[PDB]
Ligand binder design. Structure first.
Ligand SMILES: Cc1cc2nc3c(=O)[nH]c(=O)nc-3n(C[C@H](O)[C@H](O)[C@H](O)COP(=O)(O)O)c2cc1C
Ligand SMILES: COC(=O)/C(C#N)=C1\SCC(=O)N1c1ccc(OC)cc1F
Ligand SMILES: O=C(O)c1cc(=O)[nH]c(=O)[nH]1
Length: 365
């Protein structure tokens, strides 16, 4: 489309020329919340519908955690054409996150590095924000547009599992699915929660708390994992997810690695790397986790999706749904419809009747 080119060649590089990335993101959140967005001409076809996690999803393309950290732009994001929205990470208490600058663009790599450190309005603020549109969300959910809430831990917390449990109690009842984010690279010690013994203790507490919620307010619980795990760590996570009946996995968070070949001047900034250089590392992690869980555990695939091909590769590797963030940063809102249009085209070319038929297809080759 004309919009796709104008955004990608004029609008977004102009905004990028004028504003540091944190400013630009704040402005984007504001515009989205106000619905100041291009017409999302693409109409979701039936071949894009997916049923998973106890819900219908109109299309399989979601906004990944971190874009709407505090639940300010949910309805704007649906307007953009996302099949599902994930907010967060939310921490129990408000906290500022790290000092600025803390986000960096690598335009020559189609990548970003961030070290926000869980800047969060906190659970209470977010709770009230979601409660203000709770029945609007219930109607959206019923219409195939579910809401996920991603939970974090405060920096100075003395009991990580208690932070997650507090999140489950507070925001669980307002979410279709919850995400235990134990893979930020920007909170000290957090990724050690992916270890077998820590994860089993943590997840048992999280699941107990979730199962204590009233039926109609009981969300699915997913775990979001890093792209930098060892084979032992992957194995362990798969074992615990089966042992406990975790509902799904989000694969992956940003990478602490710096793949050879990065060109951006800012490549050696501390933080998590997202975008194109993370793409195949995340696809491979999806593939491994789908096989370790025997294809029985839904996966939301994320990292470096910017086209229909990128989405289909993750679907074929084992994702039931995909998310993106960094593509939006570079191409703007039209990227969403682009991905969907291209995905539908490729599904037809590859002889799939819909998305559902393509889930895990590479493992049946
Ligand atoms: C600026 C920024 C903030 C993010 N914040 C969060 C967060 O709060 N919680 C989380 O689980 N993931 C967060 N992520 C990771 C994304 O959700 C996603 O997993 C990652 O960016 C890979 O997707 P992408 O390559 O499409 O951006 C963040 C990523 C970026 C770039
Ligand atoms: C001065 O800033 C604008 O004009 C923006 C912005 N930001 C506009 S104009 C129409 C539009 O869609 N956006 C926008 C909204 C969300 C974004 O997510 C990255 C990016 C955008 F460019
Ligand atoms: O807040 C952040 O720094 C953040 C959290 C997270 O989970 N992933 C990420 O890349 N950044």
């Amino acid at each position: 489309t004309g919009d796709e080119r104008f955004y990608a060649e004029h609008l977004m590089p102009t905004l990028q020329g004028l504003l540091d990335p944190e400013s630009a993101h704040r402005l984007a959140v504001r515009f989205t919340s106000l619905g100041l967005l291009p017409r999302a001409r693409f109409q979701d076809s039936d071949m894009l519908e997916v049923r998973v996690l106890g819900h219908k999803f109109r299309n399989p393309v979601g906004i990944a955690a971190g874009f709407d950290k505090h639940g300010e732009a949910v309805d704007g994001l649906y307007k953009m054409g996302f099949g599902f929205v994930e907010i967060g990470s939310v921490t129990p208490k408000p906290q500022e996150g790290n000092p600025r600058p803390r986000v960096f663009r690598l335009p020559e790599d189609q990548a970003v590095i961030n070290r926000y450190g869980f800047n969060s309005h906190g659970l209470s603020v977010v709770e009230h924000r979601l409660r203000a549109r709770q029945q609007k969300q219930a109607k959206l959910t019923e219409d195939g547009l579910p809401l996920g809430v991603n939970l974090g831990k405060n920096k100075t917390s003395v009991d990580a599992a208690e932070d997650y449990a507090e999140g489950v109690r507070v925001l669980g009842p307002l979410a279709d699915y919850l995400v235990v984010n134990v893979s930020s690279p920007n909170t000290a010690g957090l990724r050690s929660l992916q270890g077998k013994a820590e994860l089993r203790r943590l997840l048992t507490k999280v699941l107990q708390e979730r199962d204590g919620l009233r039926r109609v307010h009981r969300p699915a619980v997913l775990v979001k994992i890093a792209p930098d795990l060892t084979s032992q760590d992957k194995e362990d996570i798969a074992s615990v997810v089966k042992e406990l009946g975790i509902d799904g996995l989000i694969v992956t968070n940003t990478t602490v690695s710096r793949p050879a070949g990065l060109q951006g001047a800012l490549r050696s900034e501390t933080g998590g790397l997202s975008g194109k250089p993370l793409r195949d590392l995340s696809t491979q992690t999806i593939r491994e986790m789908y096989a370790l869980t025997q294809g029985r555990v839904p996966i939301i695939g994320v990292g470096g999706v910017s086209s229909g091909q990128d989405a289909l590769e993750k679907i074929r590797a084992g994702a039931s749904l995909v998310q993106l963030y960094t593509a939006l940063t570079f191409w703007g809102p039209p990227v969403v419809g682009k991905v969907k249009r291209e995905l539908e085209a490729l599904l037809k070319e590859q002889g799939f009747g819909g998305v559902t038929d393509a889930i895990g297809a590479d493992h049946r080759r």
